[PDB]
Amino acid sequence: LRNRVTDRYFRIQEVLKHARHFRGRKNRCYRLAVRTVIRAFVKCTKARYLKKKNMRTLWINRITAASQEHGLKYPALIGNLVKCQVELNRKVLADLAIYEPKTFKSLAALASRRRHEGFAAALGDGKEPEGIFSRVVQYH
Amino acid sequence: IGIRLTLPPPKVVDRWNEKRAMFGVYDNIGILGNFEKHPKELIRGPIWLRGWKGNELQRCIRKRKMVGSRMFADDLHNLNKRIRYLYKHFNRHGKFR
Amino acid sequence: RISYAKTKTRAEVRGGGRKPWPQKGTGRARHGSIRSPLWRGGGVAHGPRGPTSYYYMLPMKVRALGLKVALTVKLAQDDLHIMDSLELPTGDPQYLTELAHYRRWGDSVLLVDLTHEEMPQSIVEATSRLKTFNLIPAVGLNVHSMLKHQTLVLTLPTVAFLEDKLLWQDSRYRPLYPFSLPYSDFP
Amino acid sequence: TARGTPSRFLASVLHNGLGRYVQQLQRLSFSVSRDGASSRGAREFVEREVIDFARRNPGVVIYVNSRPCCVPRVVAEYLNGAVREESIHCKSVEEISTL
Amino acid sequence: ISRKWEKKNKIVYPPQLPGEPRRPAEIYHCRRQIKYSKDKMWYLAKLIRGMSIDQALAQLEFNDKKGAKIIKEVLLEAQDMAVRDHNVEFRSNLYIAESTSGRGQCLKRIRYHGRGRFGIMEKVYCHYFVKLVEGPPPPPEPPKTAVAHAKEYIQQLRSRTIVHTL
Amino acid sequence: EGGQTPFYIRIPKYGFNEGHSFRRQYKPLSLNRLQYLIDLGRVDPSQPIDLTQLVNGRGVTIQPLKRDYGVQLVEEGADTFTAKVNIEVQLASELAIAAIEKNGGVVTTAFYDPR
Amino acid sequence: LTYFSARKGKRKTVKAVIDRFLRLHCGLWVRRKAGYKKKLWKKTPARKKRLREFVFCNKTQSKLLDKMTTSFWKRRNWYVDDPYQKYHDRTNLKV
Amino acid sequence: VKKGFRAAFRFQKELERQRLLRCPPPPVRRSEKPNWDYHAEIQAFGHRLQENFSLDLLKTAFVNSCYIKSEEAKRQQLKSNQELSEQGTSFSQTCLTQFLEDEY
RNA sequence: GACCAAUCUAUCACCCUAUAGAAGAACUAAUGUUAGUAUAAGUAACAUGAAAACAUUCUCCUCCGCAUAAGCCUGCGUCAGA
RNA sequence: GCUAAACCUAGCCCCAAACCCACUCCACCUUACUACCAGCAACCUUAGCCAAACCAUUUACAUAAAGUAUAGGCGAUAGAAAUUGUGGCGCAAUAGAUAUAGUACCGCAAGGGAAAGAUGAAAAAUUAUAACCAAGCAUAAUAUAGCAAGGACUAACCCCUAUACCUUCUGCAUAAUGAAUUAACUAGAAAUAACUUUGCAAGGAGAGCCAAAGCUAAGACCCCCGAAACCAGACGAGCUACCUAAGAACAGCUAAGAGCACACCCGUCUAUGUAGCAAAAUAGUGGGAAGAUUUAUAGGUAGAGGCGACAAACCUACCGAGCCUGGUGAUAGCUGGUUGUCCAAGAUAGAAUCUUAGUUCAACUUUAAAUUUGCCCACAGAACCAAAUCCCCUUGUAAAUUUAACUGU
Ligand SMILES: [Mg+2]
Ligand SMILES: [Mg+2]
Ligand SMILES: [Mg+2]
Ligand SMILES: [Mg+2]
Ligand SMILES: [Mg+2]
Ligand SMILES: [Mg+2]
Numbered sequence A: 001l002r003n004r005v006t007d008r009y010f011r012i013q014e015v016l017k018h019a020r021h022f023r024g025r026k027n028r029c030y031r032l033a034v035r036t037v038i039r040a041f042v043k044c045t046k047a048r049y050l051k052k053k054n055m056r057t058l059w060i061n062r063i064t065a066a067s068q069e070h071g072l073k074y075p076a077l078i079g080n081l082v083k084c085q086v087e088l089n090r091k092v093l094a095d096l097a098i099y100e101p102k103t104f105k106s107l108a109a110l111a112s113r114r115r116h117e118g119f120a121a122a123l124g125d126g127k128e129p130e131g132i133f134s135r136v137v138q139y140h
Numbered sequence B: 001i002g003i004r005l006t007l008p009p010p011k012v013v014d015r016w017n018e019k020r021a022m023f024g025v026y027d028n029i030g031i032l033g034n035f036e037k038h039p040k041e042l043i044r045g046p047i048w049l050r051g052w053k054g055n056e057l058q059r060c061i062r063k064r065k066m067v068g069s070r071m072f073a074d075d076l077h078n079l080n081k082r083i084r085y086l087y088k089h090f091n092r093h094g095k096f097r
Numbered sequence C: 001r002i003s004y005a006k007t008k009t010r011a012e013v014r015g016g017g018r019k020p021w022p023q024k025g026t027g028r029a030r031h032g033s034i035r036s037p038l039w040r041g042g043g044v045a046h047g048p049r050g051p052t053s054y055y056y057m058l059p060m061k062v063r064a065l066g067l068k069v070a071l072t073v074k075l076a077q078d079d080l081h082i083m084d085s086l087e088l089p090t091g092d093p094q095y096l097t098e099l100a101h102y103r104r105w106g107d108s109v110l111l112v113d114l115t116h117e118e119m120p121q122s123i124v125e126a127t128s129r130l131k132t133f134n135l136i137p138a139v140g141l142n143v144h145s146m147l148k149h150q151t152l153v154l155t156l157p158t159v160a161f162l163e164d165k166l167l168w169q170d171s172r173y174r175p176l177y178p179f180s181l182p183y184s185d186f187p
Numbered sequence D: 001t002a003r004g005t006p007s008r009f010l011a012s013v014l015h016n017g018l019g020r021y022v023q024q025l026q027r028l029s030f031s032v033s034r035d036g037a038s039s040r041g042a043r044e045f046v047e048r049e050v051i052d053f054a055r056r057n058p059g060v061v062i063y064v065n066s067r068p069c070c071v072p073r074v075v076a077e078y079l080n081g082a083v084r085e086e087s088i089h090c091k092s093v094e095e096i097s098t099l
Numbered sequence E: 001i002s003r004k005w006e007k008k009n010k011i012v013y014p015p016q017l018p019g020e021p022r023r024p025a026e027i028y029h030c031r032r033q034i035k036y037s038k039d040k041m042w043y044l045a046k047l048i049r050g051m052s053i054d055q056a057l058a059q060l061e062f063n064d065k066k067g068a069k070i071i072k073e074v075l076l077e078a079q080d081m082a083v084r085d086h087n088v089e090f091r092s093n094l095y096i097a098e099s100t101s102g103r104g105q106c107l108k109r110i111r112y113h114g115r116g117r118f119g120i121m122e123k124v125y126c127h128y129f130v131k132l133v134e135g136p137p138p139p140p141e142p143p144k145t146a147v148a149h150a151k152e153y154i155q156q157l158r159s160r161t162i163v164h165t166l
Numbered sequence F: 001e002g003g004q005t006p007f008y009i010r011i012p013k014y015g016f017n018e019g020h021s022f023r024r025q026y027k028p029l030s031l032n033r034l035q036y037l038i039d040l041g042r043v044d045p046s047q048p049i050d051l052t053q054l055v056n057g058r059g060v061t062i063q064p065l066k067r068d069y070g071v072q073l074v075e076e077g078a079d080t081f082t083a084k085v086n087i088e089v090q091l092a093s094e095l096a097i098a099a100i101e102k103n104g105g106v107v108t109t110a111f112y113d114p115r
Numbered sequence G: 001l002t003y004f005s006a007r008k009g010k011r012k013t014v015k016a017v018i019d020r021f022l023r024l025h026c027g028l029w030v031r032r033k034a035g036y037k038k039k040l041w042k043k044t045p046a047r048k049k050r051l052r053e054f055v056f057c058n059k060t061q062s063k064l065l066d067k068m069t070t071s072f073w074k075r076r077n078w079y080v081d082d083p084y085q086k087y088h089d090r091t092n093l094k095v
Numbered sequence H: 001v002k003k004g005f006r007a008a009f010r011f012q013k014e015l016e017r018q019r020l021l022r023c024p025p026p027p028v029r030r031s032e033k034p035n036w037d038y039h040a041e042i043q044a045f046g047h048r049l050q051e052n053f054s055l056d057l058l059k060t061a062f063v064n065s066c067y068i069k070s071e072e073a074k075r076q077q078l079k080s081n082q083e084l085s086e087q088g089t090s091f092s093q094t095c096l097t098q099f100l101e102d103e104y
Numbered sequence I: 001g002a003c004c005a006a007u008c009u010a011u012c013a014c015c016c017u018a019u020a021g022a023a024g025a026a027c028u029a030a031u032g033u034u035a036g037u038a039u040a041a042g043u044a045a046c047a048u049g050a051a052a053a054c055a056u057u058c059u060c061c062u063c064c065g066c067a068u069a070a071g072c073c074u075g076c077g078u079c080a081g082a
Numbered sequence J: 001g002c003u004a005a006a007c008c009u010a011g012c013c014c015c016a017a018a019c020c021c022a023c024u025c026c027a028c029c030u031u032a033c034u035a036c037c038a039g040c041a042a043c044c045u046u047a048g049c050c051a052a053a054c055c056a057u058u059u060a061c062a063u064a065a066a067g068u069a070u071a072g073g074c075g076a077u078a079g080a081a082a083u084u085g086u087g088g089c090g091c092a093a094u095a096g097a098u099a100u101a102g103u104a105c106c107g108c109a110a111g112g113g114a115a116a117g118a119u120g121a122a123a124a125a126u127u128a129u130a131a132c133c134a135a136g137c138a139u140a141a142u143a144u145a146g147c148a149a150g151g152a153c154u155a156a157c158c159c160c161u162a163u164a165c166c167u168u169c170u171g172c173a174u175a176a177u178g179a180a181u182u183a184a185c186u187a188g189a190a191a192u193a194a195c196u197u198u199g200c201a202a203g204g205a206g207a208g209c210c211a212a213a214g215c216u217a218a219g220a221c222c223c224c225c226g227a228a229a230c231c232a233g234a235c236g237a238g239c240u241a242c243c244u245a246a247g248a249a250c251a252g253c254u255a256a257g258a259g260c261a262c263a264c265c266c267g268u269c270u271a272u273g274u275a276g277c278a279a280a281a282u283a284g285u286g287g288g289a290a291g292a293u294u295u296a297u298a299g300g301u302a303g304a305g306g307c308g309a310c311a312a313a314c315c316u317a318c319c320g321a322g323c324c325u326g327g328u329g330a331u332a333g334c335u336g337g338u339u340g341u342c343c344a345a346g347a348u349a350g351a352a353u354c355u356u357a358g359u360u361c362a363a364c365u366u367u368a369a370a371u372u373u374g375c376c377c378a379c380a381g382a383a384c385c386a387a388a389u390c391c392c393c394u395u396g397u398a399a400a401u402u403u404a405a406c407u408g409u
């Protein structure tokens, strides 16, 4: 032959190194190993958004469970927390609820106070308390 | 397995060989040798071609019309078959037309 | 360069022509003539056919410009050298090698002369027993040999002949017919 | 491909952030080639960048093998014992400096 | 071709010191080219693994199988070599440690079907390896009782940490 | 074109290049070209301006093949022309003939066979 | 079309095009409208006058005719007396 | 016989790596390896911790008694680390006790 | 459009790399071809009449057997090992 | 570790150079390897596939002139002269000649056709290298669940996810074909013309060819396997159909191309067999069995033919006309495939076509370049027998025309 193939086994090894823990011929035969590695890479690249959504849902469920244990709901709690210029993501909320029950208890108390103040305002239109905890701090 | 095991021996190569040290020498004799011999006559190869690029079919027709008078029977038949196949594939089969 | 590789196509291959296992008969893959590129030991589908040749000429002015460029490169690079007569006091390769090493020339000193008939026996014998130094007449000067070697050596007559033959290429009329003809003005 | 690849929890080698800061890089061995077009970048580095790099942090010692090598490599050892033997085959001076 | 089991018998270890164990002597032996299948040889090997040499020979002497006599002769030759060459005093203090049986170099023949066809008839050949280690045989791994299962469950429940957080 | 009458067949025939293999042809020769040649040295006016002199000076490169039987003349450089020399060209017009004669020249015509 | 001949190994020109067309150095192909010599009694004078006039070719048609010809036909035409002498060269053009 | 060479070299390197992975040799001291320095390495180690101290004393602080005995036995065919180590451990214990008493 | 695994050629290299010239220059498939090996699978098919001193005897069947034209060429005798 | 994996040297292709071989001893045209005895032999236009989308006349066997004249269902095409003038940028046992050899094997016949081997200085070295590299197994069998993989997890499973690849077609896991892996072989050769860069310039090229800025030189572009089927001569009546010469067979019983019934000839039916005993077998019921009966031996009838109690049946297992050779690597609007990484632009109104499974033009799309207007645009302008549409300044913008290319729809 003329300048035939002389560097093929290394390609097979590089393709199989990612298949050193599969079942069946997927960890030996190159034909099926190629498709297996391709599918594995595609799924690993597509599962990032799924992982993000799963983590978000898990944090939401944890915060809802903490609120229920403290005596509140997740939507109302989030609304009251947002209605106080106290922006806090869900990860920190879950971490506090897990490793800081007193912090989450104080946060739930503040949320309930804000809820009651908003209800009183909507009922009587203020005049002129405007909620001691309400009244956002203006900026310029 | 397709790949062998033991490496090969040291492929010795004499860069200063008699032909390498004299490769290309005595060429271009026309531009300075008051034009006495064309470089196309320096190459040592076939007799039917010695300074004409051409193509496959053209080279085959050349070899036929220049050596076909003293070629073997089987060789001449194979050359004729090759010429006919090349013609049928070029002047009919292909693309861009 | 003139290639020489030649394969055997499916037609030029010996044997074959029948029809093993008919189409609608056996349940094997459809096949026609044995020795096909899909079989073992058959002919090559596409390959080198006959001895090819990548021959093609270039303008003489392009060659002259290339030679001038090679000369300028060998000169500006502190590699060119001019002499008066390629002679030696004895004619031993050891003496020439020692002189080249002392003068800090290099290893591959390309010596050039003219005529080829006026070569002295001393330098001839000194160069006919080495692998780096080679005696080549001015008539046989190219670019490959100049770029392959390190330094270059020339003499007054060689330089004059080279300059004349490289300047004649400039300021000339059309060839009309091959320059091999006698020509009046041209010698 | 995490299931088929080992993992490790984030941590430090000695909590250098608390007290003093110790350079984790230990030594550097350059295998430059004198005659060879496959180490021009490494040569230019060892010429006009290695001195500045060594003087910018005296807590690291660098060596220069300068042996007949066909592929220039760099051995980056560490205190814990890890070794990162990388290759710098055909690389600009800026790329080698950044690496 | 690849002979190695016969070469393993020439391994040499350095001289042991007084403050060191006895190190049970290992034995290696195998017969090449055996006109027999491989699945039955592996069955016989699995049958003769944890048992000693005496029980192995006793079971082989009453095993209606062609390979039984071959395995018995192989074990007898291995015991003789161990008592003679490898230097071993006790003849019954040897037990089987490893036993396999791989295929050999097979030929090819024709069977001739009832039509214009046929099939390849390979001459299945096999081998037989055995490893006899000095000393008495080890006891069989007893089944884990309920206490072991409870301990494993308690360990698994105690070795669990929070997930997806600090 | 799939089977229909191709475009290059639907057009009828005509005697366009009928006798094209025999129609005499001559390379044009401009008076400005002659003046430029005389000024650049080649084709000196001290000798007859025969076809050999023009071929040597390489002013109008012709070819024996291609049904060419000499060289013709053109009345381009009618003005700013001063050569004064016997010119020999196969064809010539009255305008250029007079333009050359008034300058002291002698216009003539000949016929060169193929060989 | 014959891309490669069987004797010399070169291209071949279709004589039909050479007989039904006319080459010009300017890069255009001249032709003649068909029907200029059949059923002339039923054609109105305007139609007969329009049919007795030459016509040029399109870009694709000109390229096809060129492909069907060789470089030999692209030579000049310094005829002693030809009516198409003032058409081989095109002057006054800006894209 | 494939006309490959670089692929053969890569395969030989892979086989050498596999052999090294098979029977890995014992971990030899880094001092015996080729690329190694003593004075420069000691200076780099001293400058890494960000301070300044004598070099001869630091060198002597690394010489043990068993090492000196082995060197003498080999030569038959540079002080010690007793007082220095004692002072170091005493100072470390005192500092740790003081810190624990001041903070706890 | 930008790169690039393998080879030969001219160039310092020389624990394997660079500049240009060439493609029989780069396989998960063409009921593709060659070589070994899984799959049904140890599944389908299969023979050797009985006792015994291995001398010998017993049970059953037979349209089969004898020599030859056609046809084969040493093809169940001895000697040693399989 | 069983089985395995590599070695490279014998030899092959090209021309470069000469023009080659050929009876020791017997034997060889009769039945070839046969010591021996009365009878004609020779010279033959090659056809055919294929392209014109069929196909009859038609289609090929140093340089320039010139792919010109000329011939041609004047269309697909064919195409002259006078003049001129001693090594491999090769192959290294699936490659190279098929070759260790034209060897068995199919075979009565023409005819087709492969591999043997691997360390070396001593195999008259005992004694083995370093195990490691694919496919099948042992060391080491499985433990809810579901394209065999991911996020993970302190952990294997347990938690959530997602309908194998390629080709076709508007549409896919689809139940449309392809597939058991591994190692080797295996599928884009270039053209008038065009684009980019070198050198000179109204000239260049190492005669010939082109010139109202041109030419030269280089770089870059045109796949494989697959039928039915024809021509000319060999090989084929040892089985089948017919003919020719000389021979053989037909118990017995009842009594004449008579009847039953041995041997014997063929097989109307059942059952088994269906990769079996057999690429056409086993039992009786079946017709004949001194006659149009069967058969041992030899010769003759060969494909546009022979033969034929016509079954258009047979002619060596497949005969609506057996195989081989050389034309045929035939052709083919048709099935299948057409090998490494990454970036960008990238969906078509219709017409013709012995045509709608195919081709061309047009239209869409891509590249380099010169030009200036490209789209919604506002008053208005645009017919007697409803949503609407065309031109359209300022206004948003940056798009549009053309030139030279060429694949793709
Ligand atoms: Mg989200
Ligand atoms: Mg053939
Ligand atoms: Mg072949
Ligand atoms: Mg039609
Ligand atoms: Mg493969
Ligand atoms: Mg299939």
Ligand SMILES: [Mg+2]
Binding pocket: none
């Ligand atoms: Mg395949």
Ligand SMILES: [Mg+2]
Binding pocket: I040
């Ligand atoms: Mg089964």
Ligand SMILES: [Mg+2]
Binding pocket: I048
């Ligand atoms: Mg029996």
Ligand SMILES: [Mg+2]
Binding pocket: J050, J051, J331
């Ligand atoms: Mg055809």
Ligand SMILES: [Mg+2]
Binding pocket: J051
């Ligand atoms: Mg046809």
Ligand SMILES: [Mg+2]
Binding pocket: none
């Ligand atoms: Mg002639």
Ligand SMILES: [Mg+2]
Binding pocket: J093
């Ligand atoms: Mg071969």
Ligand SMILES: [Mg+2]
Binding pocket: C041, J096
């Ligand atoms: Mg071969």
Ligand SMILES: [Mg+2]
Binding pocket: none
């Ligand atoms: Mg394996």
Ligand SMILES: [Mg+2]
Binding pocket: J148, J149
């Ligand atoms: Mg998976």
Ligand SMILES: [Mg+2]
Binding pocket: J166
């Ligand atoms: Mg595909």
Ligand SMILES: [Mg+2]
Binding pocket: J167
């Ligand atoms: Mg397809």
Ligand SMILES: [Mg+2]
Binding pocket: J169, J170
């Ligand atoms: Mg469709």
Ligand SMILES: [Mg+2]
Binding pocket: none
């Ligand atoms: Mg399916």
Ligand SMILES: [Mg+2]
Binding pocket: J213
């Ligand atoms: Mg121009």
Ligand SMILES: [Mg+2]
Binding pocket: J237
């Ligand atoms: Mg017969």
